[PDB]
C-alpha cells in the first residue's frame, strides 16, 4: 500500500542525489581562489531611523532607494524618507503583531501582515491625502511571514500555515496556492524577472516556485534547522538562505546544490535576515548576535561587521541601486549603513 | 524649490511625531499579555472570566480589559499551527505569558507532561528569557474528583508524586482532601522545578490555581503584572 510509493519516492530521491553528485566537480570554493578578496568592509551608520516603539520585524526599501517601509510590533508601518530621516507616513495597523511588510515597486501601496493571518494592503496615494486600507487578503490559516508585491495587483505572501499564496489584490481572492513545505514558511524572495520566487521554511528546506504555474520547481536542502531568511542573488540564478543552525548557504537553481556555506565557529546564533548587495559579491546577514555580518559571497569569508544594534537584527534591506543597507532590529531602530 | 519640499516634509514629520508621541503614551500605558495553553486547558474559561470583570477565523484574538484603569491587551493565539517556535518569539516584549494548563485532562492522557515540556521550552527560549509567565493551573474542579476517587493516578505518569507530601507553605481551602492538595502543589512544584532551574532573576513564574467560577484571575494577572513591572524597575536600579 504505502510502502510501494514510499520506496518509489526514495528511488526518486536517490536519483536526485546522484544527479546532484554528478554535477559536483568543483564549486565556488575552488573556482574563486583566483579572485582577490573583498578585504575589510567598513560600513558606517549614516542615518538612524527612530520612531518605532517596539521591535521592528520587517522592513522594505522602495524602488526609488529612498523611501523605506518599516513594520514594528506597535501596529505601525512607518514610511521613512531615508535621505532626510523624515517619516513620510505613519500607518496604524488593525493588528499589532505584524511580522512582514512590503513596499509596492510602484510606490503606491504598502502591504503588512503577521499573526492576524491577513495581508493588509494600504493605499499610499489617495485623493483624501490619507493612507487607508485598500484591501485585506484573508485565506491564510497561519501567520503571515512574508509578503512581496509582484505588482500593484498581485502579491505573493508566505504563511505559517506551511503554504504560499498569490493574491489578486483588486479582487482580494487568493489566485494561486503554493503547497509543499512541511514547516512554517518564513521568508519569500521574488526573482528579478518575477516569474519565480523562493520560499524557505521551518522544514530546513527552500523551494523554488513558478508563480504562474503554482508548481514547486525545485527543493533545496542542506540546512540543518529552520530557514529564517531567503534572498535572491541579483541575477536570479541563485539564492542565499539564512538558518537557525547559524549557517548561511548559497544555492544555485540550475546546479540544484548548495554552492557556498557561510559559517564560523564563533557564530552560534541563527541568521534572521539575508540580503545581497547590488553586485552579489557581498552577502549581508543579520544575526541573533545583534550584529550583521558582511560575507564575501564568493570567498565565504567575513568581509565586515555592521555592529551597532542593541538587540536582535530582524530585517535587512539593500537598496535597489546598492547605495545603502537598512538594518532594523529588535532594539526599535533602523540604521542606514553605507 | 528644494526648501519648499523640505518644509513640507518637516511639517508632515512633525504631525507624525505628535501622533507617535500620543501613540507611545498609549502603548507604554498598555500591558500586553500572551495567552497560551492547550485546547482543553480552559483558555476559554480564562477569557470569559477576564471579559466578565472552527470558530476561530482570525489568527489573533485581542481582548482588552481595564483593571484599576490599567489597560491590558490579552492576545489569544488562535488559528495557528501547533508549531510555536517561530511566532512565540513575537511575544518577547509582552508583559507576561499567561500559561493555562489542563491539569485535570491528565487521565490525551498526559496533557500535564505536554504542558510541562511547553513550559520548559518557554523558559529556556533565549527570546523569552526575560518574559515572565503567569501560570494558571486551570482545572481543579476535575483534579479533585479524579485524585480523591482514585481516577487520576498521578503516580502512574509521575512516580515521584508517590513520594511527595503537601509542602510546608501550602494553603489549602477548608475541607479539601489532602491528596488533592498534594496533587495541586505537586504539579505546581513540577512547574516550579522547571522555573527555578533557569530563572536567574531575569523572569519569573507566578503559579496560580483557578477554576470555572474563579473570576479573580482578572486581578491575579493584574497583581502579577504589577509585580513583573516592579521587578523590571527594581532591576533597572539594581535593587533586586
Amino acid at each position, epitope marked *: 500500500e504505502l510502502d510501494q510509493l514510499r520506496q518509489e519516492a526514495e528511488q526518486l530521491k536517490n536519483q536526485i542525489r546522484d544527479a546532484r553528485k554528478a554535477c559536483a566537480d568543483a564549486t565556488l570554493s575552488q573556482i574563486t581562489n583566483n579572485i582577490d578578496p573583498v578585504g575589510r568592509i567598513q560600513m558606517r551608520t549614516r542615518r538612524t531611523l527612530r520612531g518605532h516603539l517596539a521591535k521592528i520585524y520587517a522592513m522594505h526599501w522602495g524602488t526609488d532607494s529612498r523611501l523605506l517601509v518599516s513594520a514594528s510590533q506597535d501596529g505601525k508601518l512607518i514610511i521613512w524618507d531615508s535621505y532626510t530621516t523624515n517619516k513620510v507616513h505613519a500607518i496604524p495597523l488593525r493588528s499589532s503583531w505584524v511580522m512582514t511588510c512590503a513596499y509596492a515597486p510602484s510606490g503606491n501601496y504598502v502591504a503588512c501582515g503577521g499573526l492576524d493571518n491577513i495581508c493588509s494592503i494600504y493605499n499610499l496615494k489617495t485623493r483624501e491625502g490619507n493612507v487607508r486600507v485598500s484591501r485585506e487578503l484573508a485565506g491564510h490559516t497561519g501567520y503571515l511571514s512574508c509578503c512581496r508585491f509582484l505588482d500593484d495587483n498581485q502579491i505573493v505572501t508566505s504563511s505559517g500555515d506551511t503554504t504560499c499564496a498569490l493574491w489578486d489584490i483588486e479582487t482580494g481572492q487568493q489566485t494561486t496556492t503554493f503547497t509543499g513545505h512541511t514547516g512554517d514558511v518564513m521568508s519569500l524572495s521574488l526573482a528579478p524577472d518575477t516569474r519565480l520566487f523562493v520560499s524557505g521554511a521551518c522544514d530546513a528546506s527552500a523551494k523554488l516556485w513558478d508563480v504562474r504555474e503554482g508548481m514547486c520547481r525545485q527543493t533545496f*536542502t542542506g540546512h540543518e*534547522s*529552520d530557514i529564517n531568511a531567503i534572498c535572491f542573488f541579483p541575477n536570479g540564478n541563485a539564492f542565499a538562505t539564512g538558518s*537557525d543552525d547559524a549557517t548561511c548557504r548559497l544555492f544555485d537553481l540550475r546546479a540544484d546544490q548548495e554552492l557556498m556555506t557561510y559559517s564560523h565557529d564563533n557564530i552560534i546564533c*541563527g541568521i534572521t535576515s539575508v540580503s545581497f548587495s547590488k553586485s552579489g559579491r557581498l552577502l549581508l546577514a543579520g544575526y541573533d548576535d545583534f550584529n550583521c555580518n558582511v560575507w564575501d559571497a564568493l570567498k565565504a569569508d567575513r568581509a565586515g561587521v555592521l555592529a551597532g544594534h542593541d538587540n536582535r537584527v530582524s530585517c535587512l534591506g539593500v537598496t535597489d541601486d546598492g547605495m545603502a543597507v537598512a538594518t532594523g532590529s529588535w532594539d526599535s531602530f533602523l540604521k542606514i549603513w553605507n | 524649490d528644494q526648501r519648499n519640499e523640505e518644509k513640507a516634509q518637516r511639517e508632515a514629520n512633525k504631525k507624525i511625531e505628535k501622533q507617535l508621541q500620543k501613540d507611545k503614551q498609549v502603548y507604554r500605558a498598555t500591558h500586553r499579555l500572551l495567552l497560551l495553553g492547550a485546547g482543553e486547558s480552559g483558555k476559554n474559561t480564562i477569557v470569559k472570566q477576564m471579559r466578565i470583570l472552527r470558530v476561530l477565523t482570525s489568527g489573533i484574538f485581542e481582548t482588552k480589559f481595564q483593571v484599576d484603569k490599567v489597560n491590558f491587551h490579552m492576545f489569544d493565539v488562535g488559528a495557528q499551527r501547533d508549531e510555536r*517556535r517561530k511566532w512565540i518569539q513575537c511575544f518577547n516584549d509582552v508583559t507576561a505569558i499567561i500559561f493555562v494548563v489542563a491539569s485535570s485532562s491528565y487521565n490525551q492522557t498526559n496533557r500535564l507532561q505536554a504542558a510541562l515540556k511547553l513550559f*520548559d521550552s518557554i523558559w529556556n*527560549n*533565549k527570546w523569552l528569557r526575560d518574559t515572565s509567565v503567569i501560570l494558571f493551573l486551570n482545572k481543579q474542579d476535575l483534579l479533585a474528583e479524579k485524585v480523591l476517587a482514585g481516577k487520576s493516578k498521578i503516580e502512574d505518569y509521575f*512516580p515521584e508524586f508517590a513520594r511527595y507530601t503537601t509542602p510546608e507553605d501550602a494553603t489549602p481551602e477548608p475541607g479539601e482532601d489532602p491528596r488533592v492538595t498534594r496533587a495541586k502543589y505537586f504539579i505546581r512544584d513540577e512547574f516550579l522545578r522547571i522555573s527555578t532551574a533557569s530563572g536567574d532573576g531575569r523572569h519569573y513564574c507566578y503559579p496560580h490555581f483557578t477554576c470555572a467560577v474563579d473570576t479573580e484571575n482578572i486581578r491575579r494577572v493584574f497583581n502579577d503584572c504589577r509585580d513583573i513591572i516592579q521587578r523590571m524597575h527594581l532591576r533597572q536600579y539594581e535593587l533586586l
Partner: nanobody
Amino acid sequence: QVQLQESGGGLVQPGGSLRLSCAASGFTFSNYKMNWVRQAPGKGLEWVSDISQSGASISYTGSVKGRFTISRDNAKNTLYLQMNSLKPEDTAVYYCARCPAPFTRDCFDVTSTTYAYRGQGTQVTV
C-alpha cells in the same frame, strides 16, 4: 537533508526489553538536544525522553523512569533508548526527534503533528 531513521522495534512480550536506535544524518548530531517521542495507537504524540548535547542532562516522562535509558553516541551520531520492563501501554510508534535549533535548551514543537526534524518512527508492540 535532516534524516532520522529508527530501528530496533518489533513485537516483544510484556516485561521484555528492546534497544531502539536512531541513526541521524544531515546535521551535526552533537550540537542538538535529542529526544524520543511516542505516538500511542489512537492517541496523540507524547514526549518520552530528552538527552542534551553532551548527554549530561537526561530527562524522562514519568511513565518510563527506571525502565527506559536514553544515551547518545556523538561519535557514531546515534541515539539509543533501552527499554526494560516493557508494558502493554508502551505499545506505540516511537519517533526519534531532534529539537529544532542547535546550542539551545528549548526544544519547541518536538511532539507536534507535523514536526520536520523527526523520524518516520518504528512500531514497538508489547
